[model samples]
Target: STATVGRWMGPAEYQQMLDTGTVVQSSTGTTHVAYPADIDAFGKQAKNGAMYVEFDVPEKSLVPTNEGWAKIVGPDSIEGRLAKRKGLPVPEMPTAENITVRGEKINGEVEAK
Candidate 1:
């Protein structure tokens, strides 16, 4: 099974995916994608030339990226913010290994090669 994942893309980039299925990676050769729930914030902040696209990814193609996970699972996560309100210590985060998620099923375009 595949999970529905999302990534923000530009118009040209989105079209390229549909036309060639060539997914680009950053300098480090990795693409950072987000969970469905986590992507709206970006969409809310988006302007022209940027949009969020949903895509299908095989279970074996993903792992929660370290940088992305840090914002959602650690002391900086939402739960952590709640702790601040209560003057409680933030909970420790799970190790990356514990969060290994081979994920995402693309939506339209059959994109992300």
Candidate 2:
């Protein structure tokens, strides 16, 4: 199923597509599409980490919703050390309990109840 929302594609995989000029095609494969302008922006902001994939969806196909995943990038400087020590933030989606990391779904068992 094609996703309407943009998502994060691993940096290595995303770079591979750029190097080869073609994306992989498998049962579980995914596609990343973006406008040239967006690509330029990505190139400028890319930190050699994960790549954000952007998509274009028609207004008619869009629906208003407050639920979505939120990504928090870790701060790298000394001033942000306190926030980092505080711990990572959590998403408030309905099934946030099913949150994943690096493509791995964190199974049942959240430390705090």
Candidate 3:
């Protein structure tokens, strides 16, 4: 199997990628991506100018998200709050909740260079 990941790139966040050629990493220092099968799922659930992109990574670079450490934010809180100032729609805070990640969401740390 290949190590491909599905990522939702938004207009606001995409700006950084265009500038630096790298997706912005999350608080955990990892560039998050979704399972290939979950690509459409992430796109459907998170709609606000989100564009899906698939990238290939090594299997050793992938990290499987578990219930304990896979969570992105608290149930009451959301992510990309600062992005609101950018004049774009608020982004979705995808956590490691089951079903949303598409079977099992595994991610890998990006070079971010």
Candidate 4:
């Protein structure tokens, strides 16, 4: 539950993305980021503040199935702590907040989530 996924990307990363205009969208399916495939909608909840990973997911698929699922709460904090430990600008997660990680328990439920 209340788990969130994130990645550490700084200004350099953003600039590269902008310069390349590369929508480096990663998904289980080759098509859209969301569909009948494994698209976990962490919700568009928005990611403001510093350079970091994204919390973009479709509202359709992202649902835990059973009571078994890997969870990473406060991913922002997680990244931040990691960075701090390693001496870097803090890493922060999206604005999904902490709550019950309800939805499909399988499929696109673990791993990346």
lDDT (0 to 1) per candidate: 0.47, 0.33, 0.43, 0.33
lDDT of residue 68 for candidate 4: 31
| Best by the lDDT measure | 1
Residue by residue across 14-109, what tens digits does model 3's lDDT show? 555445544355544445566543454454455554555554444444445752122222112234444455564544333221111122222421
Q: Write one digit per residue (lDDT tens) for candidate 1, span 11-110.
A: 6656655555534433333455675424553544445446566666554445455554212223454555677789986544221221222222243222
lDDT of candidate 2 over 11-107, digit per residue (tens): 5654554554433231232222332213333343334444455433332322233433222222342323554577743211111111122221113
Prediction RMSDs, each to the true structure: 12.2, 17.3, 13.7, 15.3
- Candidate 2: pairs in clash: none
TM-score against truth, every candidate: 0.47, 0.25, 0.43, 0.20
Query: Taking the tens digit of each residue's C-alpha lDDT, what string does model 4 give over 34-69?
Result: 222222443232133223334333233233434332
Query: Residue 39 in model 1: shift from native, Å?
Result: 4.0
Q: Which stretches of candidate 3 lie over 4 Å from their true place?
A: 27-31, 66-113
Clash counts for all predictions: 9, 0, 0, 11
Error of 4 at 4 (Å): 13
The better-scoring model by lDDT among 1 and 2 is 1
